[PDB]
Design a protein around this ligand. Structure first.
Ligand SMILES: Nc1ncnc2c1ncn2[C@@H]1O[C@H](COP(=O)(O)OP(=O)(O)OP(=O)(O)O)[C@@H](O)[C@H]1O
Ligand SMILES: Nc1ncnc2c1ncn2[C@@H]1O[C@H](COP(=O)(O)OP(=O)(O)OP(=O)(O)O)[C@@H](O)[C@H]1O
Ligand SMILES: [As]
Ligand SMILES: [Mg+2]
Ligand SMILES: [Mg+2]
Length: 571
């Protein structure tokens, strides 16, 4: 593998959701550790659990993997990190200050900005601090889908620019934030990210035109940030030997070949590695030890409920919010577009929204349909809207110097997040009179947006003197659908997401097993084995996790445009 050639200390595996960042990161960490190196594997995705991949109980603590000598694993928990940050800020004054003052200080640290900054501080401590990672020769970061990862990697530069501009009064974080003591650390992080001899950035993609376009956009953004000498890894490439004697495999292979040949002109120069599709789920060392090397090398008739029944059930309501959630890459955007176009074709007023920052619905819907309002949440426009709204609502009474200080405070990088939340809330407020199909951002970001803990609400009311959850908790006006894949890790992640939703009072309305190879009768031996492995996950979802569910096959033609999207609802 090209990226496994004189690797630097740090290696970032970025890309669109579901492309194989975690699988490839685990495989490379295993390969490096087995070579005699001291490797640490950091997982920056809140919604994923590398313990299921490795079979060990990896947690926030740096836990060695017994199966692989010299390999250790770590998971950055935003909530645990926030609790540790709050404790280290509040403990010195426990008893010293009056209990009322302690309660007030704890109140000031309950906002979502503190939750963001704690995780960011842990990330930059892993990047820069030397004592913290002294006994590791390599640190492999496995990031969340690109939508959140680009913001994570932009945060170092944004915070460094905010601090070095002389505007250190990030009143959102509180008077005890003490951002200045991290001023150098953040700066160091930037210098660590933009140095090709310290960090290697690997963009993981799949042989699909939409994925390749999004990866090209991500590469443009990262190059703008300052990261140089990136590598590219195309994963899930169906072997060319399976195309024979299987029309489905032949169509998939032809589509992947065309996507590779039509790669965006920007990515044609990056050193490119190719990872094939394997007949087994990449769980455990036995399956992860043979991911980066090619395998030497009647169909199942599946009859499961379709998605037309779910769309009929949604339409029977006549209005409300349909929120699509799940693991990255499961097909949330495709299914959102399909539901929206089907409802629009049924003569209903539909509003299709995308909460993902790095979103482009044109990859799916390239037409201008009728009875369909397609929109997206632009973080920059929303940030400017929120900034102006706060300035006029709260800055009117403040004097000129007060208004200037408020403007400096509103320019902190955390503001965008709360701005996005506001936008999200506003959108959710229009679902009572028309269908609102919301394709959500990565699972962790969306779960924070739901604001079950009230952090975002506290922050926005602090900056500005019915919450979304009060509406999501009400089945009469919302329908949360969990999109999964008929695979081990996707199903476990969906089960954990469902548990998180139920803990907050939200009961998912249905499950959608997307791109199931079992449903699409496949004759090639590889696809036969994949379907055989998918049967158990389908049974687990049907009998255990989901009471109402739908199964969508693996379409031979990638679903793009109104015709194909409406066809996967009526197969
Ligand atoms: N049934 C299907 N058959 C074939 N390809 C599919 C199917 N469903 C989705 N895809 C393809 O899966 C790719 C990734 O799915 P998609 O972008 O819709 O998922 P997502 O949940 O929005 O992902 P992410 O969280 O990474 O943004 C898309 O290119 C889409 O073409
Ligand atoms: N080369 C491959 N061959 C077969 N299956 C693969 C391959 N790469 C990934 N997968 C499957 O992809 C599924 C999702 O991949 P994975 O969890 O590695 O993605 P990710 O990029 O970490 O996802 P997320 O964005 O949600 O964090 C896993 O079930 C794994 O089985
Ligand atoms: As803030
Ligand atoms: Mg992952
Ligand atoms: Mg999406």
């Amino acid at each position: 593998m090209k990226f496994l050639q004189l690797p630097p200390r740090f290696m970032f595996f970025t890309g669109k959701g579901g492309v194989g960042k975690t699988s490839i990161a685990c495989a490379t960490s295993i390969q490096l550790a087995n070579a005699g190196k001291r490797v640490l594997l950091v997982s920056t995705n809140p919604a994923s659990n590398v313990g299921q991949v490795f079979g060990v109980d990896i947690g926030n603590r740096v836990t060695p993997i017994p199966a692989v000598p010299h390999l250790s694993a770590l998971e950055i928990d935003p909530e645990a990190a926030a609790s540790a940050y709050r404790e280290r800020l509040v403990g010195p004054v426990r008893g010293v200050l009056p209990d009322d003052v302690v309660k007030g200080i704890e109140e000031s640290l309950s906002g979502a900005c503190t939750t963001e900054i704690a995780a960011f501080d842990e990330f930059t401590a892993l990047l820069t601090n030397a004592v913290l990672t002294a006994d590791y020769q390599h640190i492999i970061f496995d990031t969340a889908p690109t939508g959140h990862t680009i913001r994570l990697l932009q945060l170092p530069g944004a915070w460094s620019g905010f601090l070095e501009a002389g505007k250190g009064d990030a009143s959102c974080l509180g008077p005890l934030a003490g951002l200045e003591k991290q001023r150098t650390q953040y700066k160091a992080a930037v210098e660590a990210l933009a140095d090709p001899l310290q960090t290697r950035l690997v963009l993981v993609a799949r042989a699909q035109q939409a994925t390749l376009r999004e990866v090209a956009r991500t590469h443009e953004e990262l190059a703008t940030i300052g990261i140089k000498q990136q590598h590219l890894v195309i994963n899930g490439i169906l072997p060319s030997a399976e195309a024979a004697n299987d029309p489905l495999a032949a169509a998939i292979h032809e589509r992947e070949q065309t996507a590779l040949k039509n790669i965006p002109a920007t990515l044609t120069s990056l050193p490119r590695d190719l990872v094939q599709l394997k007949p087994f789920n990449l769980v455990g060392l036995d399956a992860l030890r043979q991911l980066l090397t090619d395998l030497p090398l009647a169909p199942i008739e599946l009859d499961e409920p379709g998605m037309g029944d779910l769309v009929d059930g949604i339409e029977a309501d006549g209005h409300g919010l349909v929120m699509l959630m799940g693991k990255g890459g499961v097909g949330k955007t495709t299914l959102a577009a399909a539901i929206a176009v089907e409802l629009a074709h049924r003569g209903l007023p539909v509003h299709l929204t995308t909460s993902n920052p790095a979103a482009h619905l044109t990859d799916t819907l390239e037409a201008s349909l009728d009875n369909l309002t397609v929109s997206r949440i632009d973080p920059h426009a929303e940030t400017e809207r929120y900034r102006q709204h706060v300035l006029e609502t709260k800055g009117a009474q403040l004097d000129a110097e007060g208004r200037a200080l408020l403007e400096e405070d509103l320019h902190s990088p955390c503001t965008e997040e709360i701005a996005v939340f506001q936008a999200f809330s506003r959108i959710i407020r229009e679902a009572g009179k028309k269908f609102v199909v919301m394709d959500t951002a990565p699972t962790g970001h969306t779960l924070l947006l739901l604001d079950a803990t009230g952090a975002y609400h506290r922050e926005v009311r602090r900056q500005m003197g019915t919450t979304p959850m009060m509406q999501l908790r009400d089945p009469n006006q919302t329908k949360v659908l969990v999109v999964t894949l008929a695979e081990t890790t996707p199903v476990l992640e969906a089960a954990k997401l469902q548990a998180d939703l139920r803990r907050a009072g939200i009961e998912p309305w249905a499950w959608i097993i997307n791109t199931s190879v079992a449903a699409a009768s496949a004759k090639s031996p590889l696809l036969r084995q994949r379907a055989a492995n998918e049967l158990r996950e389908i049974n687990a979802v049907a009998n255990h996790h989901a009471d109402r569910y739908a199964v969508v096959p693996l379409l031979k033609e990638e679903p793009i445009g109104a015709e194909r999207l409406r066809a996967l609802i009526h197969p």
